[PDB]
């Protein structure tokens, strides 16, 4: 995360770290959506242009974390993966359309002060909140700059951007399964996701029921925190029928 700040303790208890077993390193962010299911970006697991194609045994999920690098004894919980599910129409070839994947854990994770699921939006919450200018919150342990790495989880609040502005900022083809967020050059304030933040959540706190909802997944951007560029996020609600189908079938 570029131009964010250190998270407060327990600020993002749905935050998940996708951790490579060997070599031991950060792979991506992710989020906890129930005691057995974790949501992330498909490109965290499958991205052939970079020779990425992980299997379950390659990976761990680390839940309840704050420190990036420390083993947070008695706080974090480490889970093995039972199964990965990638959206069947995930477009790794072109533009990361439908950049979403689910991971089922081998065993349920115990909730705690540091570990708690985020809500997924309903159609109405999505309609109400996914509006230009409305701010969400992005969290992760990714790089602090495009060209270093944080001690603890970082957080940044960013406004959703008008779709034509998103479109006009890039040559990449944008789809309805994406939205973009970030400040405009004339807005002064800054901030973006960056490498290593992929797969983490873009959340919004509903002013109707005071619950946090995950509206987006950190997906793609051209550089990090560049003027006139924006970060692109998977539109979770648009893909929720797939999420539900997977959980209903395999839960």
């Amino acid at each position: 995360i570029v131009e964010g700040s250190d998270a407060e303790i327990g600020m993002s208890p749905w935050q998940v770290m996708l951790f490579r077993k060997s070599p031991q390193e950060l792979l991506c962010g992710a989020s906890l959506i129930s005691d057995r299911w974790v949501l992330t970006a498909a490109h965290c697991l499958l991205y052939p242009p970079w020779d990425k194609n992980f299997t379950e045994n390659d990976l761990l999920v680390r839940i309840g974390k704050h420190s990036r690098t420390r083993y947070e004894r008695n706080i974090e919980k480490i889970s093995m993966l039972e199964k990965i599910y990638i959206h069947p129409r995930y477009n790794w070839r072109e533009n990361l359309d439908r950049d979403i994947a689910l991971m089922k854990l081998k065993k349920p994770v115990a909730f705690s002060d540091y570990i708690h699921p985020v809500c997924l939006p309903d159609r109405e919450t999505a309609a109400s909140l996914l509006q230009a200018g409305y701010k969400g919150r992005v969290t992760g342990w990714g790089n602090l700059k495009e060209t270093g790495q944080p001690s603890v989880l970082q957080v940044v609040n960013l406004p959703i951007v008008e779709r034509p502005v998103c479109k006009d900022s890039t040559r990449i083809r944008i789809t309805d399964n994406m939205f973009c967020a970030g400040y405009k050059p004339d807005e002064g304030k800054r901030g973006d996701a960056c490498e290593g933040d992929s797969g983490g959540p873009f959340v919004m706190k509903s002013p109707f029921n005071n619950r946090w909802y995950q509206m987006g997944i950190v997906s793609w951007g051209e550089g990090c925190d560049r003027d006139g560029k924006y970060g692109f996020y998977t539109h979770v609600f648009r893909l929720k029928k797939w999420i539900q189908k997977v959980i209903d079938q395999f839960g």
């Binding site: 700040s5 407060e8 303790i9 327990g10 600020m11 208890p13 959506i33 129930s34 005691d35 705690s112 002060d113 540091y114 708690h116 699921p117 985020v118 809500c119 997924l120 909140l129 200018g133 409305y134 701010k135 969400g136 919150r137 957080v155 609040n157 406004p159 919004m204 706190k205 509903s206 002013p207 005071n210 619950r211 946090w212 909802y213």
Partner: peptide, 28 residues
């Protein structure tokens, strides 16, 4: 989950985090 999206250290204790108000103020 019936309890999703409510943080033990914040909403469950009626404590706010340092920047959630910035979100609320944007929800015009």
């Amino acid at each position: 989950e019936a309890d999703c999206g409510l943080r033990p250290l914040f909403e469950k204790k009626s404590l706010e985090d340092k920047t959630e108000r910035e979100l609320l103020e944007s929800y015009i």
